[PDB]
Amino acid sequence: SGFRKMAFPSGKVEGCMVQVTCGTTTLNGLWLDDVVYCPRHVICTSEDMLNPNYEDLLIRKSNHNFLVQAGNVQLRVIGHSMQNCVLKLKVDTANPKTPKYKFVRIQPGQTFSVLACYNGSPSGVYQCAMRPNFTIKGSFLNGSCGSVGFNIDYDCVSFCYMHHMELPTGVHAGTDLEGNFYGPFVDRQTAQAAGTDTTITVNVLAWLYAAVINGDRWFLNRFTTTLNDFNLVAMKYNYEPLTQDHVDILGPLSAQTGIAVLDMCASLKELLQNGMNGRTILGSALLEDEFTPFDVVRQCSGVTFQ
Amino acid sequence: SGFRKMAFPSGKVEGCMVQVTCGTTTLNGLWLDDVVYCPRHVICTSEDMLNPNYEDLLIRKSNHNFLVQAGNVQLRVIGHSMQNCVLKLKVDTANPKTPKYKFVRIQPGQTFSVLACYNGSPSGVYQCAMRPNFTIKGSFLNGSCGSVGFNIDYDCVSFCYMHHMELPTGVHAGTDLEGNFYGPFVDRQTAQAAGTDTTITVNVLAWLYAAVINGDRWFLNRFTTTLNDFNLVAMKYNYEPLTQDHVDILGPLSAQTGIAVLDMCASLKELLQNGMNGRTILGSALLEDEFTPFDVVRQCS
Ligand SMILES: Cn1nc(-c2ccc(Cl)cc2)cc1N
Ligand SMILES: [Cl-]
Ligand code: NA
């Protein structure tokens, strides 16, 4: 029994984290086979960052300007190039700890584990959702750029996030590992803001199923509803639309608990319209939306990784 | 910026997890140097749930009754001994991945990470606190026994918890790595029930200091309190007493924020009285008690 916000075991990614220095700037890199990946903004001074020309800044650098430390060992940079907003540093040695891995770009609503790192050294691991507004509500201090986000699918690490910056509201923005930003953001010091965010409806539902599975059942009711009626309610409360695919994805949870997705939707309708009336669900007084359907099944079935 | 329930990176513990089988029972073991640690109830049969005599069950076992699998590899058991409620299986290979480590018994309110595992393989990592009633609010399925809790301090892993059982209320009980149970619990299936649980007041206060550090001040007020008046109020909300030790421990965070500890206590008293009135604090609509003073300083710097 029990239900916790849970990250993937982070060992396979810890073995890939290195320190990357360029001039006065230190941040983290991801060392896989013989390439170290990191944010291309590592090459900027504070004035460069105001309006960088990255290709120009880069051609003036050469390999020896990139100091890469793996633990206490130096790696030799033998090539450098950019792909979108990530720098790729070719090094003279493949990472003997390279896991089975893929670069995957995730969808808003999907969750992943962040391995927060400082000076190449892993400091903490936590679970994030990619918000509908393409930010993440991370926890990062200066030095954390280049920390990565990932999922594990059997024994394959799917890397999905590299940290690049913090926005003025204190939420975080970054790229996939091919350096495409999530969201309408750019790597430069200019005025940027998170858009208004919404709540991830299918995840809230998954979490209600998790609550039922763990014995927390007070919010269930005799009613059911339709997608169209419920989606009207979601719109009014700044919830994402629920699609048939979401209903399909929640299928197993509906068969297992005896609460149909639209039966649950009627519980959620009532919760949005009336609140919790002093009660909690799985220990929370607000509706949690950072567990996917897959997260809830995984944790309530005990799947493992090697 | 940001504030998250964050766990320690788990890789140093992952390379210590093994599967231990005795009879028809499989659970997890922790392999450090040439010893595998696991709950002694792995030797119980369905008859031995209620009043097992562990010394009598163990003397009947030989080394080869214990199967220990590390990844794909069988380890050879060359010795066994019991210490309190843990079994220590001596094996013929020292773990090459053994980290720097120590065994530390923690006090209620302390936090630690748990590497949940099944069949010797890690499932997930999350953050827990030792509740005042010596249980933990974990996430454990059948087959999770022998999963461990830990902190990591400058590459040294301090193992503080081994998972033994789930109580009827859904909360969890276990031992330190010397095999002594936290709280009044025993490894028998006889009805036992956790003390009424209470909120970890010193941690809530730390977390309110984290909220101020991250830019949030709406819940402060112009008042202060004596320590005794605070405790008189807070125990009516099932809050643990705040001690002068706790007041001292909050000294650094008070200094950093400029809010005296007893002034923060006054803000907490009002919050218990008023609720949050539809506001949130660090993204929560409840007061959070699973961050220690030390956690807050490490996460906020
Ligand atoms: C001088 N400077 N530069 C930044 C910045 C902005 C966006 C990105 Cl992606 C990376 C860094 C913040 C400050 N203070
Ligand atoms: Cl302690
Ligand atoms: Na219903």
Side-chain angles (χ1 to χ4, degrees):
Chain A
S1 325
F3 199 71
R4 280 277 186 178
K5 188 145 286 186
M6 182 185 299
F8 286 99
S10 60
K12 290 175 149 82
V13 177
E14 292 167 54
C16 308
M17 305 300 311
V18 300
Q19 178 179 254
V20 175
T21 303
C22 185
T24 60
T25 293
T26 298
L27 49 64
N28 313 273
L30 189 68
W31 180 24
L32 299 166
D33 311 295
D34 61 348
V35 179
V36 171
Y37 301 87
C38 76
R40 66 179 185 172
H41 70 60
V42 69
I43 70 183
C44 303
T45 61
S46 267
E47 70 221 15
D48 290 324
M49 279 307 302
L50 299 178
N51 182 351
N53 183 330
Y54 286 101
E55 173 171 285
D56 216 37
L57 300 180
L58 196 58
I59 203 65
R60 308 155 153 267
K61 296 269 172 232
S62 50
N63 294 331
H64 49 56
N65 280 158
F66 299 102
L67 278 61
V68 180
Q69 300 198 33
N72 279 271
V73 202
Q74 279 243 69
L75 292 187
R76 172 153 317 211
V77 174
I78 55 165
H80 49 277
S81 62
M82 292 189 346
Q83 179 178 14
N84 298 312
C85 304
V86 305
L87 241 186
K88 291 159 66 170
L89 303 179
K90 192 55 83 135
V91 294
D92 70 351
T93 311
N95 184 358
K97 305 197 216 179
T98 304
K100 185 196 213 178
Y101 77 90
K102 302 214 280 143
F103 287 172
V104 311
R105 180 171 179 90
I106 60 164
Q107 303 254 107
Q110 300 194 314
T111 55
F112 57 102
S113 300
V114 175
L115 181 74
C117 299
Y118 294 94
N119 301 291
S121 202
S123 67
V125 66
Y126 56 89
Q127 199 62 2
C128 295
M130 179 65 65
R131 305 303 312 174
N133 69 356
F134 289 104
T135 64
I136 68 176
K137 289 173 190 171
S139 171
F140 297 112
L141 309 158
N142 288 173
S144 64
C145 295
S147 294
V148 299
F150 65 98
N151 285 285
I152 311 191
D153 317 274
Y154 210 146
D155 57 321
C156 179
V157 179
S158 291
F159 292 104
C160 63
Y161 181 85
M162 188 163 262
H163 185 51
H164 287 242
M165 53 192 276
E166 182 177 290
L167 293 175
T169 37
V171 306
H172 302 102
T175 67
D176 60 33
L177 264 292
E178 294 175 3
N180 302 297
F181 261 93
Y182 289 100
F185 307 110
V186 300
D187 46 0
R188 143 181 73 242
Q189 168 105 309
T190 196
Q192 307 191 71
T196 86
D197 204 13
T198 57
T199 298
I200 311 148
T201 312
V202 57
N203 286 8
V204 175
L205 288 174
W207 173 80
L208 292 179
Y209 280 108
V212 174
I213 286 171
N214 283 259
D216 226 335
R217 297 178 64 110
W218 63 261
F219 51 85
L220 297 177
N221 65 32
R222 73 155 60 234
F223 308 109
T224 193
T225 189
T226 56
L227 279 57
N228 278 63
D229 286 336
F230 180 71
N231 278 319
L232 293 177
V233 177
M235 185 138 63
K236 164 159 150 159
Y237 290 93
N238 274 321
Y239 268 55
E240 289 283 296
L242 196 71
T243 71
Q244 184 61 44
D245 199 42
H246 294 153
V247 172
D248 294 332
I249 297 168
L250 291 159
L253 290 174
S254 168
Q256 174 194 334
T257 63
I259 302 98
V261 178
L262 286 170
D263 179 3
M264 210 57 93
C265 282
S267 288
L268 179 52
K269 274 182 28 43
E270 297 309 317
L271 288 165
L272 291 172
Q273 287 171 355
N274 305 277
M276 295 204 221
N277 299 142
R279 312 177 254 201
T280 59
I281 294 174
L282 282 176
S284 173
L286 46 61
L287 300 180
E288 277 302 290
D289 75 345
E290 294 207 353
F291 293 95
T292 72
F294 284 81
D295 291 346
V296 170
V297 163
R298 193 169 317 90
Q299 182 168 169
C300 307
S301 79
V303 152
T304 70
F305 314 94
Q306 311 313 294
Chain B
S1 178
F3 205 77
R4 274 267 185 208
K5 198 68 80 52
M6 218 174 47
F8 282 95
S10 61
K12 294 181 164 63
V13 179
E14 288 171 52
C16 297
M17 323 298 305
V18 301
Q19 189 184 241
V20 177
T21 304
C22 180
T24 88
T25 296
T26 291
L27 46 60
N28 305 279
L30 181 72
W31 175 27
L32 297 167
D33 300 318
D34 59 349
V35 184
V36 171
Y37 302 78
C38 74
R40 71 178 178 175
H41 70 65
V42 71
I43 72 184
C44 299
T45 83
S46 311
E47 305 273 338
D48 310 292
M49 286 334 106
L50 281 166
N51 294 286
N53 183 317
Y54 285 103
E55 158 188 2
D56 195 80
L57 294 175
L58 191 57
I59 203 174
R60 310 180 182 254
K61 294 277 182 303
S62 34
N63 291 323
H64 47 283
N65 295 130
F66 300 107
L67 305 211
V68 174
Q69 198 175 309
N72 238 7
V73 164
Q74 285 321 102
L75 300 192
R76 172 178 299 101
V77 174
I78 75 194
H80 60 272
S81 84
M82 173 173 64
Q83 172 180 14
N84 298 310
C85 304
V86 299
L87 226 191
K88 299 187 292 190
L89 303 180
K90 190 142 109 83
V91 295
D92 215 1
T93 303
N95 186 354
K97 309 182 164 133
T98 300
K100 259 171 205 202
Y101 76 91
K102 60 209 209 144
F103 292 170
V104 302
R105 184 182 180 85
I106 57 173
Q107 297 298 311
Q110 182 61 264
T111 58
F112 58 89
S113 303
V114 170
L115 181 63
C117 327
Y118 302 91
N119 297 105
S121 67
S123 175
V125 63
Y126 57 87
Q127 196 63 0
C128 268
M130 177 67 44
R131 306 299 309 168
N133 68 358
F134 295 96
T135 62
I136 71 170
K137 283 150 127 303
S139 178
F140 294 120
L141 305 170
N142 294 138
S144 61
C145 299
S147 293
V148 298
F150 61 96
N151 286 289
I152 307 187
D153 326 293
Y154 311 92
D155 281 327
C156 182
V157 182
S158 38
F159 291 103
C160 61
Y161 180 85
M162 196 174 243
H163 183 51
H164 283 246
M165 44 189 198
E166 182 169 297
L167 295 158
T169 49
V171 305
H172 306 99
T175 70
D176 55 30
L177 268 289
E178 299 189 312
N180 296 302
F181 261 91
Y182 287 102
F185 309 106
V186 291
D187 49 0
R188 287 160 68 195
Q189 306 270 54
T190 198
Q192 46 197 316
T196 56
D197 203 32
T198 54
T199 299
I200 306 156
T201 308
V202 65
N203 283 5
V204 170
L205 288 171
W207 170 83
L208 288 174
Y209 279 112
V212 176
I213 291 171
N214 274 65
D216 206 347
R217 295 182 54 107
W218 72 256
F219 46 82
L220 301 177
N221 67 25
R222 59 175 198 89
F223 299 120
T224 191
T225 180
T226 69
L227 180 56
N228 196 244
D229 281 345
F230 173 77
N231 283 326
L232 289 172
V233 174
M235 287 154 84
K236 297 168 190 182
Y237 296 93
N238 250 27
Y239 270 59
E240 280 301 292
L242 194 76
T243 65
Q244 187 58 40
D245 274 14
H246 298 139
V247 178
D248 293 343
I249 281 171
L250 288 167
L253 280 169
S254 169
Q256 195 198 319
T257 61
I259 307 163
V261 178
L262 291 176
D263 285 12
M264 211 39 104
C265 288
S267 168
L268 179 50
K269 295 166 55 183
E270 184 165 279
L271 274 169
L272 298 171
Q273 169 190 278
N274 292 354
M276 260 174 188
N277 292 136
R279 286 158 296 190
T280 56
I281 296 177
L282 297 172
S284 179
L286 286 186
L287 305 178
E288 169 70 43
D289 71 349
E290 297 212 338
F291 294 99
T292 68
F294 186 108
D295 289 343
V296 168
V297 170
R298 172 184 199 271
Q299 177 158 184
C300 301
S301 237

